[PDB]
From a paper:
Here we present aficamten, a selective small-molecule inhibitor of cardiac myosin that diminishes ATPase activity by strongly slowing phosphate release, stabilizing a weak actin-binding state. Binding to an allosteric site on the myosin catalytic domain distinct from mavacamten, aficamten prevents the conformational changes necessary to enter the strongly actin-bound force-generating state. In doing so, aficamten reduces the number of functional myosin heads driving sarcomere shortening. The crystal structure of aficamten bound to cardiac myosin in the pre-powerstroke state provides a basis for understanding its selectivity over smooth and fast skeletal muscle.
To better define the mechanism of action of aficamten and to explain its specificity for β-MHC, we co-crystallized β-MHC with aficamten and Mg.ADP.Vanadate. The structure solved at 2.33 Å resolution revealed that two β-MHC motor domain molecules were trapped in the pre-powerstroke (PPS) state in the asymmetric unit. The electron density map unambiguously identified the position of aficamten and the nucleotide in both molecules. As suspected from competition assays, aficamten targets the same pocket as blebbistatin, located between the U50 (upper 50 kDa) and the L50 (lower 50 kDa) subdomains in close vicinity to the inorganic phosphate (Pi)-release backdoor. Little conformational change occurs upon aficamten binding, the primary difference being a new position of the Leu267 side chain. A more detailed analysis of the pocket shows that most of the interactions are hydrophobic in nature with only two electrostatic interactions. The first electrostatic bond involves the carboxyl group of the L267 main chain that forms a hydrogen bond with the N–H moiety from the amide bond between the pyrazole and indane of aficamten. The second electrostatic interaction involves a hydrogen bond network between a water molecule with the nitrogen from the imidazole of H651 and a side chain NH2 of N654 of β-MHC and nitrogen 4 of the oxadiazole from aficamten. Despite binding to the same site as the nonselective inhibitor blebbistatin, notably aficamten is selective for cardiac β-MHC relative to smooth and fast skeletal muscle myosin. Specificity is likely achieved through the above-mentioned second electrostatic interaction involving a water-mediated hydrogen bond to residues CarH651 and CarN654 of β-MHC and nitrogen 4 of the oxadiazole from aficamten. Inhibition of ATPase activity by the compounds results from prevention of rearrangements of the myosin internal cleft, which are required to change the actin interface and thus the release of the hydrolysis products.
Author numbering: 33 to 201, 211 to 369, 371 to 625, 645 to 731, 736 to 782
Write the structure that this text describes.
């Protein structure tokens, strides 16, 4: 009835209510919690009829507003219906539990199904991108958005699983078996426990799934972006180092502990035990087996696996190396056991490593001079080297996985799946958090441009009568602040080329250029107990307080080139190969990666999947209404649905239209492909307002095409 509505609520955003009376521009209502409320007319939103309950596509709702969307999602989620269409894109809510929706019977049933003839699913997104790839002969992209913990990695792995299982119907196993095992292997080394996610991705990735001209699974490749090197040697209070360290220490493979000359205790290793060492949801012993098996399935040799294990163990001993001041400021080893162990594993000479660390060489023409190092300088250098070998080993692994994923099958098109590290806010936000949050901001803007800009531009260039709608979805100001010349990165990069520059001159340069000048740049909110911040940035998903200490060193990433030389001359083949090519700042590389990805993505047909984290307590089935609403708001879910309802989501070239639908009325076209389409459409018993004629394509309102498709099925049968 007109009695069933939604009213704004302080704690739950919106609550259901029954209108009791209407007077003086005000509505009196009882809120389905029993509260009797009086609100203004403009605040009361209509409930959709029971026939629209748990609707699969929210673009079909009679009333479209925030609580209509929120409650449709909540009701579907309560029935463990975790995917929902929102116009031409999909929304998914993290169930925080295994559901029986991803088995091989489910994958087989989705094969070739049109979006509307199957329930909302990641398999349907995957299949429909495959159908467009073969129909349009163009590359596709599956762009999975969300904050840390929302389910991007899970959905990425489900898209891969779909094509590998479909295909099933240079290593140990088949291409299908190897594509499935790539992620367990990368995750042991590139994922870690943070406060928001027990298995947080500490690298971004773009996986291309290659197909031949006829659509047969040909190959796959992975590109990874800026692994969080700092985690190797440093952890905040409620986080862990990379999974692998704890997987090895689990003692599930006693032969590994012996080979690496390590104990079973993570607290004996300084680099890996600054935060937490166990995760309730993770069995590190079983995970070690899964990692080891993944390397086998990917055709890694025993020599390649043992070298990765040895280098992981050597990083552990490297962190335990003690230094003291030389009695007379110059540092000297305070023991040699830990260096001897790490040198043995790294195929180096212990005495050479220690002398290279304390006394690095400075080139003076064709002569050299030893540079002095204090204890702080040595422990910094020792940390920088450990990060470099780890990151280089991870990059080597990705290259090695790619080599096995290369088959002798030709490639025509691909479906690329993007899985970035999601938006996050820690108590301490450093350079990593800026790089991560800037990527999320860029990916949201890619969505805004595609959905709101390119869409309305398409109507304009095709001569469709259209009034431009400003959806309030434009992040160009914040993006420009971070990436354009004289922005945050540009200033950091410039401060990098100055020897007298400090964290405070870089801070001063940021303030002098942007405080009260750039709207998205603000002064921070520092609270008692919580860490100190230097500036705050207004991102799409919230304001983030950034601490700029160490950003100049983080951006330059300097290495002791004397011990890098020793790595190059190592008797361990892998270590020498890791530093073989050793001779840009990390922000310049980040901007380059992003620019390259964004231009390459505009040459693909994108498919958006919006992952939503339901709560902060990893609780299955519980919705924190303000947290879901915030994510739907900053994602532009409502606006994205509005353009599907207000605009013309489908369009077909006249020639392709005349061909496919002549069967609906052959007497109409027994003449030009446009005249044919015009006479064909005009002769059919449809709402002639549901379509518009453009310069090259016929444009359709949501629903007209499906009806035309039903009509084509009836006639062929
Ligand atoms: N569809 C899903 N089904 C089951 N568990 C899921 C699903 N999506 C996410 N999860 C859970 O949420 C956690 C965080 O999800 P993940 O995909 O790693 O997030 P992110 O977006 O940070 O990459 C996972 O470890 C898993 O326990
Ligand atoms: C280009 C598309 C893209 N970038 C990413 C990404 C970008 C940065 C980072 C992470 C992911 C997850 C970890 C973080 N790393 C750093 O900040 C960082 C800082 N110093 N180094 C060496 C790395 N995902 O997707
Ligand atoms: O927790 V995440 O995988 O989004 O980084
Ligand atoms: Mg992830």
């Amino acid at each position: 009835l007109k009695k069933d509505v939604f009213v704004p609520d302080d704690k739950e955003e919106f609550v259901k209510a029954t209108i009791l009376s209407r007077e003086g521009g005000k509505v009196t209502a009882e809120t389905e919690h029993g509260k009797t409320v009086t609100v203004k007319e403009d605040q009361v939103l209509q409930q959709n009829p029971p026939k629209f309950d748990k609707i699969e596509d929210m673009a079909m709702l009679t009333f479209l507003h925030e609580p209509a969307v929120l409650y449709n999602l909540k009701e579907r989620y309560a029935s463990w219906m975790i995917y929902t269409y929102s116009g031409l894109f999909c929304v998914t809510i993290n169930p925080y539990k295994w559901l029986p929706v991803y088995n091989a019977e489910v994958v087989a049933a989705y094969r070739g199904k049109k979006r509307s003839e199957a329930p909302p699913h990641i398999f349907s997104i995957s299949d429909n991108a495959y159908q467009y790839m073969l129909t349009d002969r163009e590359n596709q992209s599956i762009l999975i958005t969300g904050e840390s913990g929302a389910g991007k990695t899970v959905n990425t792995k489900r898209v891969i699983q779909y094509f590998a299982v479909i295909a099933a119907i240079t290593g140990k196993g088949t291409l299908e078996d190897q594509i499935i095992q790539a992620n367990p292997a990368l995750e042991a080394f590139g994922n870690a426990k943070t406060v928001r996610n027990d298995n947080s991705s500490r690298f971004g990735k773009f996986i291309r799934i290659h197909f031949g001209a006829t659509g047969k699974l040909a190959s796959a490749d992975i590109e990874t972006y800026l692994l969080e090197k700092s985690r190797v040697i440093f952890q905040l209070k409620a986080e862990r180092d990379y999974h692998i360290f704890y997987q090895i220490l689990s003692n599930k493979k006693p032969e590994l502990l012996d080979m690496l000359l390590i104990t079973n205790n993570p607290y004996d290793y300084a680099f890996i035990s600054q935060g937490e060492t166990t995760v309730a949801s993770i069995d590190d012993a079983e995970e070690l087996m899964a990692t080891d098996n993944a390397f086998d399935v990917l055709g890694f040799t025993t020599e390649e696996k043992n070298s990765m294990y040895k280098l992981t163990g050597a990083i552990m001993h490297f962190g335990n190396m003690k230094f003291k001041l030389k009695q007379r400021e110059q540092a000297e080893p305070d023991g040699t056991e830990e260096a001897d162990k790490s040198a043995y594993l790294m195929g180096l000479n212990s005495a050479d490593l220690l002398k290279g660390l304390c006394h690095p060489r400075v080139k003076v023409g064709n002569e050299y001079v030893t540079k002095g190092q204090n204890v702080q300088q040595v422990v910094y250098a020792k940390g920088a080297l450990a990060k470099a070998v780890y990151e280089r080993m991870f990059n080597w692994m990705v290259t090695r996985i790619n080599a096995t994923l290369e088959t002798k099958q030709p490639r025509q098109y691909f479906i690329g799946v993007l899985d970035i590290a999601g938006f996050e806010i820690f108590d301490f936000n450093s350079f990593e958090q800026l790089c991560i949050n800037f990527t999320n901001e860029k990916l949201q803007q890619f969505f805004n441009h595609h959905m709101f800009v390119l869409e309305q531009e398409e109507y304009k260039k095709e001569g469709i009568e259209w009034e431009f709608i400003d959806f309030g979805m434009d992040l160009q100001a914040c993006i420009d602040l971070i990436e354009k010349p004289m922005g945050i990165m540009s200033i950091l990069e410039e401060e990098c080329m100055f020897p007298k520059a400090t964290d405070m001159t870089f801070k001063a340069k940021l303030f002098d250029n942007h405080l009260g000048k750039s709207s998205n740049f603000q002064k921070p909110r520092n609270i008692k107990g919580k860490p100190e911040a230097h500036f705050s940035l207004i991102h799409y998903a919230g304001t983030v307080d950034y601490n700029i200490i160490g950003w100049l060193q983080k951006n330059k990433d300097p290495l002791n080139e004397t011990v890098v030389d020793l790595y190059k001359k190592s008797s361990l083949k892998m270590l020498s190969s890791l530093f073989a090519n050793y001779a840009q700042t990390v922000s310049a590389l980040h901007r380059e990666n992003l620019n390259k990805l964004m231009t390459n993505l505009r040459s693909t047909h994108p498919h958006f999947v919006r992952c939503i984290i339901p709560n902060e307590t990893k609780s299955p089935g519980v919705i924190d209404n303000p947290l879901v609403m915030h994510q739907l708001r900053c994602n532009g879910v409502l606006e994205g649905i509005r353009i599907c309802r207000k605009g013309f989501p489908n369009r077909i070239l006249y020639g392709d239209f005349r061909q496919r639908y002549r069967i609906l009325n052959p007497a109409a076209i027994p003449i030009d492909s446009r005249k044919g389409a015009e006479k064909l459409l005009g002769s059919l018993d449809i709402d002639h307002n549901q379509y518009k004629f453009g310069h090259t394509k016929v444009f359709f309102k949501a629903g007209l095409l499906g009806l035309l498709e039903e009509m084509r099925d009836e006639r062929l049968s």
